[PDB]
Amino acid sequence: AEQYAAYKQKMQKIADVRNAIAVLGWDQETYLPEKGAGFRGQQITTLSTIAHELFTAPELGSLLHELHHHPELDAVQQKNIALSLEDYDKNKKYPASLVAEISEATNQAYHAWIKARKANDYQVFEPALARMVELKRKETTVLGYEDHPYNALLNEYEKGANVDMLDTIFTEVKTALSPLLDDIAKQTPARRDFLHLHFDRDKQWQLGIDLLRQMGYDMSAGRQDISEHPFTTSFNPLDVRVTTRIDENDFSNMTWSCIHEGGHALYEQGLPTEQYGLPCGEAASLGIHESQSRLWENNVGRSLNFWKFQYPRIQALFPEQLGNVSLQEFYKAINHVQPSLIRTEADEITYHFHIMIRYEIEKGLIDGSISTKDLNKTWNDYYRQYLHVEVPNDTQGVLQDIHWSHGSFGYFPTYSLGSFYAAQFFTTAQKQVPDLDVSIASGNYQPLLEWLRNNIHPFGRFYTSNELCQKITGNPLQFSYFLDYAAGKFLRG
Numbered sequence: 001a002e003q004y005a006a007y008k009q010k011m012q013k014i015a016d017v018r019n020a021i022a023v024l025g026w027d028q029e030t031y032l033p034e035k036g037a038g039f040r041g042q043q044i045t046t047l048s049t050i051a052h053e054l055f056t057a058p059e060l061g062s063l064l065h066e067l068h069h070h071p072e073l074d075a076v077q078q079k080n081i082a083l084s085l086e087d088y089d090k091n092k093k094y095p096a097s098l099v100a101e102i103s104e105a106t107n108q109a110y111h112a113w114i115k116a117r118k119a120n121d122y123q124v125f126e127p128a129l130a131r132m133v134e135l136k137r138k139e140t141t142v143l144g145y146e147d148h149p150y151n152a153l154l155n156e157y158e159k160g161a162n163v164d165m166l167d168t169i170f171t172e173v174k175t176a177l178s179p180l181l182d183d184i185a186k187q188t189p190a191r192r193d194f195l196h197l198h199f200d201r202d203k204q205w206q207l208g209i210d211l212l213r214q215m216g217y218d219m220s221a222g223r224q225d226i227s228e229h230p231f232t233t234s235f236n237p238l239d240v241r242v243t244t245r246i247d248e249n250d251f252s253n254m255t256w257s258c259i260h261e262g263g264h265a266l267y268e269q270g271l272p273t274e275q276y277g278l279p280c281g282e283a284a285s286l287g288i289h290e291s292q293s294r295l296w297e298n299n300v301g302r303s304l305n306f307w308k309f310q311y312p313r314i315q316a317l318f319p320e321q322l323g324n325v326s327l328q329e330f331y332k333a334i335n336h337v338q339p340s341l342i343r344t345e346a347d348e349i350t351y352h353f354h355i356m357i358r359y360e361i362e363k364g365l366i367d368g369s370i371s372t373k374d375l376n377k378t379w380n381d382y383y384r385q386y387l388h389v390e391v392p393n394d395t396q397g398v399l400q401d402i403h404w405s406h407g408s409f410g411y412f413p414t415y416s417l418g419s420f421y422a423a424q425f426f427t428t429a430q431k432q433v434p435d436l437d438v439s440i441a442s443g444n445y446q447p448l449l450e451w452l453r454n455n456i457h458p459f460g461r462f463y464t465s466n467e468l469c470q471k472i473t474g475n476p477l478q479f480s481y482f483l484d485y486a487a488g489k490f491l492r493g
Helices: 002-030 034-055 058-067 075-093 096-119 122-143 150-157 163-185 201-215 251-270 286-300 304-317 327-334 351-367 375-387 413-432 436-441 446-455 465-473 479-490
Strands: 222-226 232-234 240-244
Touching (some): 002 034, 002 075, 002 240, 034 075, 075 122, 096 122, 122 150, 122 351, 150 163, 150 351, 150 413, 163 413, 201 222, 201 251, 201 304, 222 251, 232 251, 240 251, 286 413, 304 436, 351 413, 413 465
Antiparallel strands (some): 232 240
């Protein structure tokens, strides 16, 4: 037990540094004075270097290798050791020259992306992106893979993800959601401009706080602040902070941002404090985290049952805006589906075409079948073919998303995975929790939070996303769940 305690001590020290970094980044987004930005960046970099030194330390590797041969340890301890050894060895695969090259190319891509957006011309970004793609292919060979090099990068951002699995899912997205979009486009346009009336900022703020409280967010172990882009950050399970943004002329923004972040935050508040710093105390994956945000935002937060209780309350809050708007009109308006250009603004149906396009492009960039030369034309053709929209300039097209300039290849699919897990989990909860829908329609979200806290939150990384989904639902991830949820909301009135 002495050796396992030394492992825990080392990991908890690393986690202390990483959470200090999180505090500095949270303040950077919320309260940092403008002229302090440079020193704040320097301070984050210094701490990041220290954390990395600690997690690559030879003594930690020797300890992990010793603990791998301890059959005495319990299931959680053994899983912690195994996952931490995987995390540790990943770094040891990379040659130092490749690490330095990736860092230099990421800096160059950051600067080139900024100036490309400001010139509104992808060709400004193109050389940096070509360099990035070359280095990413080298990285696939360093990481190793089977069947397709892109699998090495997919696996980085979602353990287990691969081209076979994702090709199947996205073929289903195409073949099932394209007809659904054709059906939606023939529908009569819905009233909706009431969402762009004036919604008092202080009333919106308190509404979001109230909704988070009702969801189960522990505001003695968290808090909300304003930031430019809503996010959730945890410094430990007892200090999980969310941000939101308020548009006084667009009610669609804050309320659903708050519910979305609430879903992340409830997960983080449910991870065990005794596993702080260890794999079984961390969220299972980006896809599972996204399933929590989407399950609350959409499967709950856009559902008629949720609004049967919440709508009269928000009408009372905003009677000049909503007092002559019916529950059905409001429900239809908050579920407006429309092919559009910007992924971050897309409704929950068309969103997945955005992801599919990025997936196909990344898959071609990494296998060599798609070049970065004239990538804007490729992008625009994909958008016209699948979403029936005509990209008017590059900032509305290939330059919209920052991920590639950060070197984040294999990241985009996790957004869709999150949505599809959310549907599979929520439908399963509706089966397994007897009075779930009635409870939701009566304003009680505790049975749902309890189900999540028994089935997902406390396990950390103990189960992979696949094992988790199979254990809870009796099935691997199946797009059919999302389809039935979406068709049920969009196709029969």
